[PDB]
Amino acid sequence: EKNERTRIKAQENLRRIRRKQIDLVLNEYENQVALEVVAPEDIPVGFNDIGGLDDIIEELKETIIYPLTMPHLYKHGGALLAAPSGVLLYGPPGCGKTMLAKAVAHESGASFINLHISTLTEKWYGDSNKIVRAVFSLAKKLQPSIIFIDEIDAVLGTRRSGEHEASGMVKAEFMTLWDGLTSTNASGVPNRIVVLGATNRINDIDEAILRRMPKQFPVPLPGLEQRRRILELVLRGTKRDPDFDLDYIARVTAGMSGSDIKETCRDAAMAPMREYIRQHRASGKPLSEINPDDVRGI
Amino acid sequence: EKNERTRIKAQENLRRIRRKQIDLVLNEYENQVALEVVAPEDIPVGFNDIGGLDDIIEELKETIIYPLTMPHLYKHGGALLAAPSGVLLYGPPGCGKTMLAKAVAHESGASFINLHISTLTEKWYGDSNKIVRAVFSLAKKLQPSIIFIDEIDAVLGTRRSGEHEASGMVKAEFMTLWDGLTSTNASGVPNRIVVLGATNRINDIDEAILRRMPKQFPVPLPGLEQRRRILELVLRGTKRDPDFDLDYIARVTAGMSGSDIKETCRDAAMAPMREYIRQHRA
Amino acid sequence: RTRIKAQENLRRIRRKQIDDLVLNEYENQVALEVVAPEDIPVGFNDIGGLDDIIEELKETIIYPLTAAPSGVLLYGPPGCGKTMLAKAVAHESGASFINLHISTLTEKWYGDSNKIVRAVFSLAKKLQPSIIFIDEIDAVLGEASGMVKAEFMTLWDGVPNRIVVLGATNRINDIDEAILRRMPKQFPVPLPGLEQRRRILELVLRGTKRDPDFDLDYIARVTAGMSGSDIKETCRDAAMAPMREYIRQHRASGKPLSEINP
Amino acid sequence: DYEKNERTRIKAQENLRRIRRKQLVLNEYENQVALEVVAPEDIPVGFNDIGGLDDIIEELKETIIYPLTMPHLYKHGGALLAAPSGVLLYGPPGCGKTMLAKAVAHESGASFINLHISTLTEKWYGDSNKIVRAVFSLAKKLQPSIIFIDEIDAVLGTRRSGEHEASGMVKAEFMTLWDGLTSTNASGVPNRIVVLGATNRINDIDEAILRRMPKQFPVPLPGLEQRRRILELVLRGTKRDPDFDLDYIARVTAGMSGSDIKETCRDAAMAPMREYIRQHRASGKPLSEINPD
Amino acid sequence: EKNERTRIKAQENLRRIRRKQIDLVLNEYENQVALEVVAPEDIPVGFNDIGGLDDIIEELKETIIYPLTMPHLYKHGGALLAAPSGVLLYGPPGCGKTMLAKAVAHESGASFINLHISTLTEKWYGDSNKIVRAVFSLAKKLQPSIIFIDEIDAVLGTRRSGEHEASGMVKAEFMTLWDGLTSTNASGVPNRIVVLGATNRINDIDEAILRRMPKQFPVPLPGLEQRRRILELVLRGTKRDPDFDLDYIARVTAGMSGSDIKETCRDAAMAPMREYIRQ
Amino acid sequence: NEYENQVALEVVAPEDIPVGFNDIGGLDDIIEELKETIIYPLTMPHLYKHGGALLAAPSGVLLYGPPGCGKTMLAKAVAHESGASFINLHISTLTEKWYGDSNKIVRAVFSLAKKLQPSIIFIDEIDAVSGMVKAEFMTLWDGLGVPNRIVVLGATNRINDIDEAILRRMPKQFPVPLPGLEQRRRILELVLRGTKRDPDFDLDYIARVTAGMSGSDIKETCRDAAMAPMREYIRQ
Ligand SMILES: Nc1ncnc2c1ncn2[C@@H]1O[C@H](COP(=O)(O)OP(=O)(O)O)[C@@H](O)[C@H]1O
Ligand SMILES: Nc1ncnc2c1ncn2[C@@H]1O[C@H](COP(=O)(O)OP(=O)(O)O)[C@@H](O)[C@H]1O
Ligand SMILES: Nc1ncnc2c1ncn2[C@@H]1O[C@H](COP(=O)(O)OP(=O)(O)O)[C@@H](O)[C@H]1O
Ligand SMILES: Nc1ncnc2c1ncn2[C@@H]1O[C@H](COP(=O)(O)OP(=O)(O)O)[C@@H](O)[C@H]1O
Ligand SMILES: Nc1ncnc2c1ncn2[C@@H]1O[C@H](COP(=O)(O)OP(=O)(O)O)[C@@H](O)[C@H]1O
Ligand code: BEF
Ligand code: BEF
Ligand code: BEF
Ligand code: BEF
Ligand SMILES: [Mg+2]
Ligand SMILES: [Mg+2]
Ligand SMILES: [Mg+2]
């Protein structure tokens, strides 16, 4: 058992040496959680990349990140003016949610970690709660640490019964360290830990935990202006302006969500590429030139 | 296994000394339960700064927390006139059942130990029952003690058929050491140990545990006066805006929880604060 | 292990003498569970007007050990005083009252999960009379749990050694029917009747005065539903009420010193 | 409790050596899928054995299977001109939905990985997700990779909150690894992993899974020409008689699937051999007759 | 735990030793179905015993068993002349829909493996799919492999929106392992394993499973002479009293489906038996 | 074989049964056909095996009619009559707890039966026999070189909606009419065998007093008028 745990420890120590740069002491449980500390330089989508929703970026930055990072600015107010306990981005499926949980991990600089729901559920008994305590132990040892759990309605969410007698503890031993008797320091700082969460079913997330994460922003499907921005941003790397008429495309795709505009642009961005390939299919060898032309998709 | 256990017992010694002094020995096995003894001065809350709850904040101070400390003035009776062995603290989420426990831990005087859920369920076989036993063996060593299992719905609960019976042995261990044949003392005192619970749904905690906790304090949602008090109480750091009328936001809450009110009042203190972004501008 | 065997020797001497014989180290560790008869303060008189199941015990269990069936069950639900009955039996029993403390059987080893099970019956064979009462018997008698269960049921039916089995499960009809059928007897403990609830009123009300409240007789009018534990907690509350009033009055001024009246 | 690991780990390397030698190190749960990759030389069918699907075989080849391999060809706007992260083959049961994926596992070149729904659902707690992030970690190691979940509407479905919670995490684990936070690289390349899915019932898969896989190819029943071509493809094992209108069978079918036609051809072809057996002969005989019905 | 698995391995080894010669490695899943491979000599019924449905027993002996065993004579065809991978025989309750399975298991070398519904339904999550997979992993390892799912309309069935979780991924996994990715071999052989489905109503079995059982032999009620055939065959070694014949009873037995005749005749068989007790 | 050991709690022993064959109420023709064709061939088959492969006892026998105790009494009695250990279904055990727990029970029942002597299985209040249990109960009753040597009995008030395929496999379906104007005399004699019968009138109006009820009022009248002249003898 030690032969595997040593390599594990070496890997997480390497990851944390890469992250911490601009050497902790770790037990075995939150050791393997150190593999989930996302390096902020490995998420190539900032806040200037996601168009459409902008006010949600406003209320997501100037009330969550400025409270977490640079807390001295929010000390004149007192104990109230701190970062909220947790955040939730609920809305229709496939519009900016997981991609807005990337810019918050790239520019925030708050020791972001992706929780990886599988790791919460361990096979041995009493090791699915050791990891739930470890995710907060490591979160506070390198605070201010943002935590993220995508799809929070399976690992979290309404119990409705004693499922398996091991899923009611991760739902409870998470809530015990979240906003429990040790959530506040001896002076008042609540450890500076904000757990995000993405979900399209807000009404299945254990409303007792709904009190836990109050900053719950609705992430609606993009409107007409939001789509006119998402087309401009998704169609950056495309020699697409012979006689391009984006006003028609941003209007016709009204009912379409914000994640299908990407695939629509993809089909409308490799159509002339397929034309060039089928043209070159006559003879020769694939040594692709840079002369397709995007005009109109479907 | 021993060196790491030696570090565990060393940290346990430090925490126990800082709790006691405000000297004893252990078995090198129950040290991992004294690593949750909450100190008295670190909990920054008290019974004075919790508006709303009044009959609870008085009934706890008179009936449970303070027949325990200074029990000499209740020594006229036998088993009676003693600390009631058990408390529940049930209520909806976000109404001050954890803050109440924090204030109890800070203003009690008994050796408050915070028994987590991850400290009872153990991987090795037979290493989860001897921790539930270590808890009640430590509570009796120094026995002003308020054990506190927060969120008693997973660690405890209605024992159903099967469901990892090794996890049912823990609840059986609680049932047998809590009020079993050796519950009280040979002199008659019931060891002066009062577990404090916490939950949002009193429907599956237990029927064989409700008897084991005679007190059940219902903490409901704050009404008119409770919200009027909590709104004034939360605004102790944030300076009051000039001409700001409190009763409007006080009455407009109208049944909202005791934490959502805190968030809506935090927004009203960050609103102007966020607005003054001029320092970088200038 | 040396400290373990030393404490074992001391506790077993204080149990037996009211001598001692050295035995296996994996069998001494269960010998630290022998509570002396003078350790329990309560007695038979501390039980209410039950005097039927306690009478059955007094006639059928303690007498033969002075044949004695091996196995006795406590059937009542939580609230009637199963553990209280067991504690009272342990006082006026005169035999060797040895509990189990199932955590003692549970061990993080492979070949040691059966040695303690052997050691319990071995020590029972060493000294008589003996008592192996195990509260919450529907906890351990549900490759380790099954092994310990099978080995316990193997040596369960070990003069028939003067060994007695007493069970106090909080719930029945879902409890070890393989061995529950083997045990001879089982005594149900129902809710308190009229005379039973009257005795419960008269017993717990021992230290408090007779006029701290309305009256004792009227309390035995709605307490029919509640059990012996809810009645005791309500009595504790009603007793603390007058002392509550007195302490609240004394809060006005004066050092918080004890008194000699409510 | 250790020999099972040794057996799977030794066979895990041996299975990978086959696909590797056709042209690495894995942890515990990755050995499960390590015994699960399909070598393209093993499957005996190719793209030229699926008739009538000239508009689906051509769109499963220009936009989903050949932006993926040789991605250097698509590097002008590579951030967007990549292979889709999944494909949904849906339609009437019995036409190509498994044959297309069987030929894609043969004539693609990518490390095709079948998913085998029984292996995702372990009886222990948490192994169902340890296998999901094992397959979505082996695909990244065997990149480029192609995952195929035949009949996706069984292992995946609408959440249905009042059901088994342990099976709502594997359905909520694809939404975390297959398009989650780490679906992209440090520069934009989304791991070059496409997940194939063939369901006989679309719209009962999910409201969120139907956006991950952006290429839902509907595979209709064989029309007037699909039957004509499937007859040609199927009746190439035994010789044909000098005169029989094979158009007649296709011209009269008009309502059968791609499997019903194969079964009818099987029933028709057995007539001459069963007649030769009616002649009570023991040895073989290379002549027969494939007359209509 | 381990001892139970070792005992199951001992049973499977004994059963394979007794069934193979009129032995291969097995896990603890396909071992569970190892106890289901019946011995041909156990079933005391042959093809000659079945009557009435004489034109269904013929097409099963020429298009299923012959294309399954000794296919070298059928090797002249490439792949079309293999055995049909699935066979269904439906009928009203009271006809020969199960006795045909016995005749196929007894007088046709097939490694007949009947799987019971309780051998598929299980308590642990993902333990039923790993048995549906073990079945087809065993049938491949010994592959005459005539699998027989009687009352298939229950173990399978119509898949709905509000369908049970565990019972919904065992219908899809089964029909995916039947005709799926690994259905064929490297050489292109169809991997001969036939599945016998014997249901009472082919209306709700599935829309995708009926194609997986292309041979659907209808088993109607016993015909006029067919009932006479069953009468003459069921009372071969029975009582032989004077001239009174079942042919008159055959005309009398207009209804009284084929299963019912086997008890009608036995009830009529106590005529000389009852008087023997009169001593 | 954990389930067959679990079902071993309901295997009533073939001996020490309350059968007492004469105690059953007045029922001759049904019991005549029973003792002639079912229980008789169960014992000493060597004297009944003159014809082979067909003289096995059919495992289908139904007792349909209003609810009562005679059908259950007859089921209890036939076991001791043929030296059979009564293994009741215990239909409340058919409730579902796990996914396939009940199907395991249905398998283990026939497992123990085939492993056991010719005792007969009983299904009290047959109404459950539409999932895997209902499927597998029709399968393992008759399925894949010796007869079953065990008969299944049918006891249920429900008729013509009881899965007629199961009705097909129930050859000797016997109507069990509990209310009988002649069986009532015998059952009242059975009752009054021990009860003191000095003051009460002759057993003639009893044949018309409990005319409506089938077999329950007669069973409750064992002590209905028994203690009526008995309270005074007990109080004084
Ligand atoms: N507002 C947006 N601006 C730009 N791209 C978007 C936006 N919303 C969705 N997308 C596209 O959707 C893809 C990821 O979708 P995602 O936001 O993860 O869905 P969900 O909202 O369910 O998390 C990205 O590739 C991105 O291009
Ligand atoms: N009675 C109260 N007065 C003031 N604030 C309260 C009160 N109850 C709860 N809160 C606020 O709620 C937060 C913690 O709530 P918590 O005690 O966890 O709710 P619950 O006890 O219902 O779980 C604290 O930050 C505190 O400010
Ligand atoms: N028969 C009785 N008469 C009077 N009081 C009783 C009786 N039984 C129980 N009690 C009271 O109720 C309480 C029951 O507590 P306990 O014996 O621990 O319950 P249990 O035995 O169910 O664990 C005792 O403290 C005792 O004072
Ligand atoms: N376009 C086609 N050309 C040739 N054969 C086909 C075609 N479509 C289906 N088939 C036949 O169908 C059989 C497999 O059907 P499959 O596609 O697996 O059905 P499903 O889509 O329900 O999985 C193969 O044996 C093949 O001969
Ligand atoms: N021709 C026949 N000869 C002998 N037995 C028959 C014949 N037809 C039906 N049976 C009997 O009828 C019973 C029921 O038929 P079966 O095929 O099992 O239908 P099901 O599967 O619906 O029960 C069988 O057990 C069989 O013994
Ligand atoms: F598609 Be996202 F991850 F909800
Ligand atoms: F939020 Be408390 F701990 F219920
Ligand atoms: F109710 Be106690 F556990 F006997
Ligand atoms: F494989 Be098919 F789509 F059932
Ligand atoms: Mg709280
Ligand atoms: Mg007790
Ligand atoms: Mg398929």
Author numbering:
A (entry chain C): 44 to 65, 86 to 361
B (entry chain B): 44 to 65, 86 to 345
C (entry chain A): 48 to 65, 85 to 132, 145 to 220, 228 to 243, 252 to 355
D (entry chain D): 42 to 64, 87 to 356
E (entry chain E): 44 to 65, 86 to 342
F (entry chain F): 90 to 218, 230 to 244, 251 to 342
Give sentences copied directly from the paper behind this entry.
The AAA protein Msp1 (in yeast; ATAD1 in mammals) extracts the tail-anchored (TA) membrane proteins that have failed to be correctly inserted into the ER membrane. TA proteins that escape this reaction are mistargeted to the mitochondrial outer membrane (MOM), necessitating their removal. Here, we present a collection of three high-resolution Msp1 solution-state structures (an ATP hydrolysis-arrested Msp1 mutant and two conformational states of wildtype Msp1) that address these outstanding questions and begin to explain how particular features, shared by AAAMC proteins adapt it to its particular roles in protein quality control and beyond. To obtain a homogeneous sample suitable for structural studies, we expressed the cytosolic domain of Msp1 lacking its 30 amino acid N-terminal membrane anchor (Δ30-Msp1) from the thermophilic yeast Chaetomium thermophilum.
We incubated Δ30-Msp1 with ADP•BeFx, an ATP transition state analog that in ATPases (depending on whether BeFx is bound) can mimic both the ATP and the ADP states, and Δ30-Msp1E214Q with ATP. 3D classification of Δ30-Msp1 particles generated two distinct structures: In the first structure the Δ30-Msp1 hexamer adopted the right-handed open spiral arrangement characteristic of AAA proteins (20950 particles analyzed). In the resulting model, six Δ30-Msp1 subunits (M1-M6) rotate and translate progressively to assemble into a right-handed open spiral, with an open seam between the top (M1) and the bottom (M6) subunits, similar to many other reported AAA protein structures. In the open conformation, we observed significant density for α0 in subunits M1-M5, whereas α0 in M6 was disordered. The α0 helices from M1-M5 are radially organized with their N-termini pointing to the spiral’s center and display a positively charged surface toward the face where the Msp1 complex would approach the membrane. In the open conformation, three pore-loops extend from each ATPase domain and shape Msp1’s central pore. Upon loss of the γ-phosphate by ATP hydrolysis in M5, we observed that the arginine fingers in M6 become less ordered, as does the interacting M6 WD motif.
